[PDB]
């Protein structure tokens, strides 16, 4: 019903991935893993799809980002880029934050 979940960690005193190199993003459902809104940031290294780097990100945060961009430019989008918003928002509201208080966040 999705893809492997994970254990999201921050990358202290290094450098991060930008939008410049990422191009694929896999999201989860409000029941796949365990309530955790997780996302996978896939970006091909070198040239094409030879060796693909895939690291974890925070679903809710990611989804919120996209939800924002879509709304911020509604004057320039129709088709999928309009239904995607309404469907992406419903997804965003499918997760429950306040449950993570008692939930074990190292399940993965």
């Amino acid at each position: 019903w999705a893809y492997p979940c994970c254990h999201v960690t921050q990358l202290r005193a290094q450098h991060l991935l930008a939008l410049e190199n990422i191009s694929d993003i896999y999201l989860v459902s409000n029941q796949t893993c365990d309530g955790f809104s997780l996302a996978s940031l896939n970006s091909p290294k070198n040239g094409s799809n030879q060796l693909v780097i895939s690291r974890c990100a925070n679903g809710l945060n990611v989804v919120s980002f996209f939800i924002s961009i879509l709304k911020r430019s509604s004057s320039a989008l129709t088709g999928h880029l309009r239904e995607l918003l309404t469907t992406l928002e419903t997804l965003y509201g499918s997760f429950s934050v306040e449950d993570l208080f008692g939930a074990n966040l190292n399940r993965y």
Partner: protein, 653 residues
């Protein structure tokens, strides 16, 4: 880069959407994906994100009700000369009654000329909203010496005021309110959902509370806003109306001394937010009707309530406002006025009279350095006075009129350019006469019973500096039907707004002013045609002669110093004042206007000065000798007559 695609999973199926922000960046200006992607900590380890959310207040009782927005802007009339705000034509393009309206596209761009940050970089906000930047306008506030401040940040779509207090230490507490159409609310960042942050909701309007629990505590100690009514009123109420509802709320606080002892309470804080909402309402109005046209009558009325509002907000608090004045609307209003028989405005209709003076205030700035604006304000007032006996109906349509006009007059007075001084001095004289015992008396009555807000009174510009804490309590109505306690508050309130609305320089223009040594003991000055009378409790005035009433009941004496030809001689009058001669000669019925350019002054033996009257024309003199203005069958009251000559006399015939 450029192309990016994400995969989802509705019900058992994998969805595929590709978002090419590369093409989007071309069709959109402010869309900078690179920044937003970083703003939202993508790699925010599961655990740390949570606390960044739980340290945010939760609108537990998120309640809402039915509140459909009222009809505001009317549909442009017939041949309404629709003009651009960006540039006014080198000449006129209208008349006075001719239909007209302004284009929204330019008007709005002019109002929201300033650019800014609806969402600052403060710890609280940076946790919820996504850094935003668009054209806006705010309302600055600073009380307790930068120890507390408010900001009325607003855009063409939503308002977001923020409160900021500081404990003795570097402690900084902040809490903000967000108002606007639910569809226009900013973009939430982390795991945030507007519902758990919205306090009041309509079919399309919301009121959000952005703040941390830590802060909400320090604030709930002195700030418990009635979100319910505060929200409704901010939704179901025409722009112009809301503007005054607030203007009145402030006047109240003013009479409560809250303008020198700025109380940090729920009421005072509430009004603040509403003050910015009043400004937001106007901006949100011109916004809804994009590429449309707002009737000039609408602006002249709406933008007026704002100008008057901005002043009180400044006189009271060192608050500032910027981003809602459009030099266009001002030039237009200015030009329009310049093309009308000002000296004959009073002979016009009521509705037309307001609209006239109304917009006259809006355009006064940008133009009219030699336009007969103050003149019109005089003509309209003159008419009002002639039709009554020194007192305007407590709630007449015209009362509202004189209030609108006073503004353009006060502004004039505050200047240092003696222009239309004679024409202006008149305004003061009339209003002074209007500040009769009947006027001052009824105003109090209403204040106590709460029927009159006390927003305006001809006294605020009158030259009657006789009414004090005690003296005012004298004019107050003597009835058991009025709470003696409530009355006191009214008297105090009136005295308060009077000391704020009126200044000491409001008379730095009057020619005779330069002749008063101990000006603090001056009861009232009466600017006449060829002379100017100075009633005071001191024989120091250096006029032409010295008069003294027979009464000694008062603390001091009652003197009358007349400055002939508005020029005073060196030194006061010789010893022994001239006594006021008593006259019974004149008969009631009068053919011509005997006491024309003259004035009447009645004083009570026990109390101070009662009422004063300036007989403008024949009609007035008749409406005085016919009515029971006189009452010689009362030893306590006396009636004086000041002529064009420095002579004074008592009446009893």
């Amino acid at each position: 880069l450029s192309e990016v695609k994400l995969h989802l999973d509705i019900e058992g199926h994998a969805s595929h959407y590709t978002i090419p922000w590369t093409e989007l960046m071309a069709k959109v200006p402010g869309l900078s994906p690179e920044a937003l992607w970083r703003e939202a900590n993508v790699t925010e380890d599961l655990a740390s994100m949570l606390n960044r959310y739980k340290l945010i207040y939760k609108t537990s009782g998120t309640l809402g009700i039915a509140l459909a927005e009222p009809v505001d802007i009317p549909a442009v009339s017939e041949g309404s000369m629709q003009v651009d705000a960006s540039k006014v034509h080198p000449g006129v393009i209208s008349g006075l009654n001719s239909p007209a309206c302004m284009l929204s596209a330019p008007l709005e761009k002019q109002l929201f000329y300033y650019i800014g940050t609806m969402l600052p970089n403060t710890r609280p906000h940076s946790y919820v909203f996504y850094q935003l930047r668009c054209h806006l306008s705010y309302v600055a506030l600073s009380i307790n010496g930068d120890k507390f401040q408010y900001t009325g940040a607003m855009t063409s779509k939503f308002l977001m005021g923020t409160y900021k207090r500081v404990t003795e230490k570097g402690d900084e507490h902040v809490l903000s309110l967000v108002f606007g159409k639910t569809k226009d609310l900013p973009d939430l960042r982390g795991p945030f959902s507007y519902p758990s942050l919205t306090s009041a909701q309509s079919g399309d309007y919301s009121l959000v509370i952005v703040t941390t629990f830590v802060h909400y505590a320090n604030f709930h100690n002195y700030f418990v806003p009635n979100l319910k009514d505060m929200f409704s009123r901010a939704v179901t109420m025409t722009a112009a109306s809301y503007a005054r509802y607030v203007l009145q709320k402030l006047v109240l606080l003013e009479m409560k001394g809250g303008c020198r002892e700025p109380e940090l309470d729920t009421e005072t804080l509430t009004t603040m937010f509403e003050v910015s909402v009043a400004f937001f309402k106007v901006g949100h109005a011109v916004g809804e009707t994009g590429n449309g046209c707002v009737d000039l009558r609408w602006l002249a009325k709406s933008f007026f309530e704002l100008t008057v509002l901005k002043d009180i907000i400044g006189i009271c608090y060192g608050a500032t406002v910027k981003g809602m004045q459009s030099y266009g609307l001002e030039r237009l209003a200015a030009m329009l006025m310049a093309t009308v028989k000002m000296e004959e405005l009073g002979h016009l209709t009521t509705e037309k009279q307001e609209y006239a003076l109304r917009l006259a205030t809006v355009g006064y700035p940008k133009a009219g350095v030699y336009s007969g604006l103050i003149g019109g304000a005089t003509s309209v007032l003159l008419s009002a006075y002639n039709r009554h006996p020194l007192f305007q109906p407590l709630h007449t349509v015209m009362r509202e009129t004189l209030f609108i006009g006073s503004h353009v007059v006060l502004r004039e007075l505050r200047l240092n350019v003696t222009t239309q001084g004679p024409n202006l001095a008149l305004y003061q004289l009339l209003s002074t006469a209007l500040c009769s015992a009947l006027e001052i008396g009824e105003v109090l009555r209403g204040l106590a019973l709460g029927t009159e807000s006390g927003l305006f009174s001809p006294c605020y510009l009158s030259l009657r500096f006789d009414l004090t804490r005690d003296k005012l309590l004298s004019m107050a109505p003597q009835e058991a039907t009025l709470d003696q306690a409530a009355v006191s508050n009214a008297v105090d309130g009136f005295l308060g707004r009077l000391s704020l609305e009126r200044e000491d320089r409001d008379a730095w223009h009057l020619p005779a002013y330069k002749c008063v040594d101990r000006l603090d003991k001056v009861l009232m000055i009466i600017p006449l045609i060829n002379v100017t009378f100075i009633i005071s409790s001191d024989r120091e005035v250096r006029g032409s002669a010295l008069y003294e009433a027979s009464t000694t009941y008062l603390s001091s004496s009652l003197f009358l110093s007349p400055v002939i030809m508005n020029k005073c001689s060196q030194g006061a009058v010789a010893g022994e004042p001239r006594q006021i001669p008593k006259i019974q000669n004149f008969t009631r019925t009068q053919k011509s206007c005997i006491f024309c350019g003259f004035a009447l002054l009645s004083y009570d033996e026990k109390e101070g000065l009662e009422t004063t009257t300036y007989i403008t024309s024949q009609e007035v003199q008749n409406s005085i000798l016919s009515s029971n203005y006189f009452d010689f069958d009362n030893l306590h009251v006396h009636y004086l007559l000041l002529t064009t000559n420095g002579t004074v006399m008592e009446i009893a015939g």
